[PDB]
Structures are given as structure tokens and as C-alpha cells.
From a paper:
Here we used cryo electron microscopy (cryo-EM) to determine the molecular structure of a human ex vivo ATTRwt amyloid fibril. A 3D map with a resolution of 2.78 Å, based on the 0.143 Fourier shell correlation (FSC) criterion, was reconstructed with the cryo-EM images. The fibril consisted of a single twisted protofilament with a left-hand fibril twist of −1.23° and a rise of 4.82 Å. The density map showed two separate continuous density regions, which after structure modelling, corresponded to the residues Pro11 to Lys35 and Gly57 to Thr123, respectively. The N-terminus lacked resolved density for the residues Gly1-Cys10, whereas the C-terminus lacked density for residues Asn124-Glu127. Between the two regions from position Ala36 to His56, the electron density map was not resolved indicating structural movement or inhomogeneity. The cross section of the fibril resembles a spearhead shape. Two major hydrophobic clusters are detectable. The C-terminal region of the peptide creates a probably water filed cavity, lined with polar and ionic residues Thr59 to Lys80. Glu63 builds a salt bridge with the Lys35 of the n + 1 Layer, which would stabilize the first region with the second. Overall, for all three fibril structures a single fibril layer is formed by a N- and C-terminal fragment of the ATTR peptide and demonstrates a very similar spearhead like shape in their cross section.
Non-hereditary ATTR amyloidosis is an aging-associated disease that arises from the formation of amyloid fibrils from misfolded wild type transthyretin (TTR) protein. The protein is a 55 kDa tetramer that consists of four identical 127 residue protomers. In order to form amyloid fibrils, the tetramer must dissociate and unfold such that the unfolded polypeptide chains are able to reassemble into amyloid. In ATTRwt amyloidosis, amyloid deposits occur mainly in heart tissue of men, where they cause severe cardiomyopathy.
Numbering used by the authors:
A (entry chain F), B (entry chain G), C (entry chain E), D (entry chain D), E (entry chain C), F (entry chain B), ...: 11 to 35, 57 to 123
The structure:
Amino acid sequence: PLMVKVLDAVRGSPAINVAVHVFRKGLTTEEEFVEGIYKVEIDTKSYWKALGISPFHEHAEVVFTANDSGPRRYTIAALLSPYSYSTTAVVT
Amino acid sequence: PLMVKVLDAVRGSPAINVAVHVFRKGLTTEEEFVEGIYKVEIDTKSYWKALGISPFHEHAEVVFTANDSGPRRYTIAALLSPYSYSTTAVVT
Amino acid sequence: PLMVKVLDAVRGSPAINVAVHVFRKGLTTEEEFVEGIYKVEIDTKSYWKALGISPFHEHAEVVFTANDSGPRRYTIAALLSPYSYSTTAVVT
Amino acid sequence: PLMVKVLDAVRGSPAINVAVHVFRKGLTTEEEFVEGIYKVEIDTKSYWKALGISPFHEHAEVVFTANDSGPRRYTIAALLSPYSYSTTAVVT
Amino acid sequence: PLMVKVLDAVRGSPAINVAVHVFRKGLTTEEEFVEGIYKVEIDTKSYWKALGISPFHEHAEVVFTANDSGPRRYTIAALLSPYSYSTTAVVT
Amino acid sequence: PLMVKVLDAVRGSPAINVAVHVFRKGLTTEEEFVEGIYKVEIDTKSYWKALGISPFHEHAEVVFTANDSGPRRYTIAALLSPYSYSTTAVVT
Amino acid sequence: PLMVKVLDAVRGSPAINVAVHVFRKGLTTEEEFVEGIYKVEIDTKSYWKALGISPFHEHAEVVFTANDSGPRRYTIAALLSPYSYSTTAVVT
């Protein structure tokens, strides 16, 4: 008897992000997994990944140049931050 | 008997993002998984990925130049942040 | 008898991020795992990862240059910080 | 009889981040694990990781140059810091 | 009979980060573990990790130069520091 | 009968970070462990780690130069320091 | 009968970081352990660690130069120092 009870009763106006996971049981491999339930990615950069089997195997002169240089701006007042009866403001 | 009960009773006007996962049981491979349930990606950059088997296998001179340089701006007052009885404002 | 009870009763307007995991039981491999339940990544950079089997195996002169140099700005008043009856403001 | 009770009763408007894990039981391998429940990563940099089997195996002259030099700024008033009845402000 | 009771009753508006783990039982390997429950990483840098089996095995002259030199600034008034009935302010 | 009771009753608005772990029972290997429950890492640098089996095995002249020299500044008024009815301010 | 009772009753608004661990029972190996419950690491540097089996095994002239020399500044008014009814201020 696996019984899970979450926020059974609520009297009011809450701000919530419920996440309930009940479980009863190739160069890259992933199996039987839960990812990105609430994963906020901002300005995420992946250049060379999982290129493959025998990549640049022989006489492969490579010139990798990664330049992350820009007037970039990110302004998030509330990230994964539920708020009740409040005042949120990005004043810019 | 697997019983899961979430937010059974609510008295009011809540702001919520419910996520309930009940489970009872090639160069890149993924199996039996839950991804991107609430994954917010902003300015995500992937250049060279899973190129393939035997990519640039022989005498492959490569000149990779990744330049992320721009007047880019991102303004999100509330990201995955449910809010009740509140004031949200991006004043710009 | 596995009984789990979370925030059973609430009288008011709380700000919450509930995470409940009840469980009753290739170069890179991951199995039976929970990732990114609430993982906020900001300005995350991954250059060369999981290149592959026999990458640059023979006579492979490589010139890797990673330059992270930019007028980049990130302003998050509340990250994974639920707030009730409060005042949040990014004044810039 | 495994009974877990968290924040059973609440009288008011709290700010909380509940995390409850009840459990009753390749070059890189991970199994049966919970990661990133609340992992905030900011300006995280990974250059060369899990390159592969036999990478740069023979006569591989490599010139790795990682330069992290930029006018980068990160301003987070509240990180994983739930707050009730308070005043949070990033004044810049 | 394994009974765990946390913050059973609350009368007011607290600021809390509850973490409850009840448990009743390849070059790099990790198994049966809980990581990143609340791990805040800021300006974390990993250069060469888990390169692989037989990396730079023979005649591999390598020139690794890691330069972390930038006008970088990080300002977090409250990190993993829940606060109730208070005033938090990053004035800059 | 393993009974654990934490902060059973609270009358007011405390600021707390509860951590309760009840447990009843490859070059690098870790098993059955709990890490990063509240691990705040700031400016953490790892250069060469877990390179692999037979790394630089023969005639491998290596020039490792790690230079951590930058106008870097980190200002955190409250780190893992919950505060109630107080005034926190990073004035800079 | 293993009974553990912590902060059972609280009358007021305390600032606390509770940590309760009740337990009833490869070149590098760790097993059955709890690490980083509240480990704050600041400016932590690890250069060459767990290189691997047979690293630089034969004729490996190595030039390791680690230079930690920068105008780096770290200012944390309250680290793992919960405070109630007080005034914390980083004035700089």
C-alpha cells in the first residue's frame, strides 16, 4: 500500500509549483530517468559534444575558437520563486 | 494499491503548476525517460553535436569559430513563478 | 505500508515549491536517476565533452582557445526564493 | 510501516522550498541517484570532459588555452532564500 | 515502524528550506547517492576532467594554459539564507 | 521503532534550513552517500582531475600553467545564515 | 526504540540551521558517508588530483606552474551565522 498525499487541503490563495514523482519498480546512453522537471537554463552554451565514433581520427588539425563576448543582459525578478500577495517589478 | 492524491481540496484562487509522475513497472540513445516537464531554455546555444560515425575521419583541417557577441537583452519578471493577488510589471 | 504526507493542511496563502520523490524498488551511461528537479543554470558553458571513441586518435594537432570575455550582466532578485506578502524589485 | 509527515499543518503564509526523498529498496557511469534537486549553478564552466576512449592517443600535440576574462556581473539578492513579510531589492 | 515528523505544526509565516531524506534498505562510477540537494555553485571552473582511457598515451606534448583573469563581480545579499520579517537590499 | 521529530511545533515566523537524514540499513568510485545537502561553493577551481587510465603514459612532455589572476570580487552579506526580524544590506 | 527529538517546541522567531543524522545499521573509494551537509568552500583550488593509473609512467618531463596571484576580494558579513533581531551590513 503506497499512499502519497501532497497539499491535500488548502484554505486560501497560495502560489505553488508541486512536483510529485512516485515510482514503484552508443557513445552516450541514459535510461529510466526524469530530467528537466523544473530546469531553467539561461545563456547555456554547448560547443562540441558527442562528435561521434572515430571523429578527427587521423591527421586532423583543428582550430577551435569559442568567443563569448557581447553586450548581453538578462533580468529576471522572480525565477522559480512563486509569490503570493506581493509586488514584483523589473524597473529598468 | 498505489494511491496518489495531490491538491485534493482547494478553497480559494491559488496559482499553481502541478506535475505528478506516477510510474509502476546509435551514437546516442535514451530510453524510458521524462524530459522537459517544465524546462524553460533561454538563449541556449548548441553548435557541433552528434556529428556522426567517422566525421572528419581523415585529413580534415577544421576552423570552428563561434562568436556570441550581440546587444541581446532578455527581461522576464516571472519565470516558472506562479503568483496570486500580486502585481508583476516589467517597466522598461 | 509506505505513507508520505506533505503540507497536508494549509490555512493561508503560502509561497512554496514542493518536491516529493517516493521510490520503492557507451562512453557515458546514467540509469534510474532524477536530475534537474529544480536546477537553475545561468551562464553555464560546456566546450568539449563526450567527443567520442578514438577522437583525435593519431597526429591530431589541436588549437583549443576558449575566450569568455563580454560585457555580460545577469540580475535575478529572487532565484528559487518563494516569497509571500513581500516586495521584490530589480531597480536598475 | 514507513510513515513520513512534513509540514503537516501550516497556519499562515510561509515561504518554503520542501524537498522530501523517501526511498525503500562506459568511461563514466552513475546509477540510482538524485541530483540537481535544488542545484543553482551560476557562471559554471567545464572545458574538456569525458573526451573518450583513446583520445589524442598518438603524436597529438595539443594547445589548450582557457581565458575567462570579461566585464561580467551577477547580482542575485535572494538565491534559494525564501522570504516572508520582507522587502528584497536589487538597487543598481 | 520508521516514523519521521518534520515541522508538523507551524503557527505564523516562517521562511524555511526543508530537506528530509528517509532511506530504508568505467573510469568514474557513483551509485545509490543524493547530490545537489541545495548545492549553490558560483564561478565554478573545471578544465580537464575524465579525459578517458589512454588519453595522450604516446608522444603527446601538451601546453595547458588556464587564465582566470577578468573584471568579474558577484553580489548575492542572501544565499541559502531564508529570512522572515526583514529587509534585504543589494545597494550598488 | 525509529521515531525522529524535528521542529514539531513552531509559534511565530522563524528563518530555518532543516536537514534531516534518517537511514536504516573505476579509477574513482563512491557509493551509498549524501553530498551537497547545503554545499555553497564560490570561486572553486579544479584543473586536472581523473584524467584516465594510462594518461601521458609515454614520452609525454607536459607544460601545465594555471594563472588565477583577475580583478574578481564576491560580496555575500548572508551565506547559509537564515535571519529573522533583521536588516541585511550589501551597500557597495 | 530510537527516539530523536530536536527543537520540538519553539515560541518566537529564531534563526536556525538544523542538521539531524539518525543512522541505524579504484584509485579512490568512499562508501556509506555524509559529506557537504553545510560545507561552505570559498576560493578553493585543486590542481592535479586522481590523475589515473600509470600517469606519466615513462620519460614524462612535466613543468607544473601554479600561480594564484590576482586582485581578488571576498566579503561575507555572515557565513553559516544565523542572526535574529540584528543588523548585518557589508558597507564597502
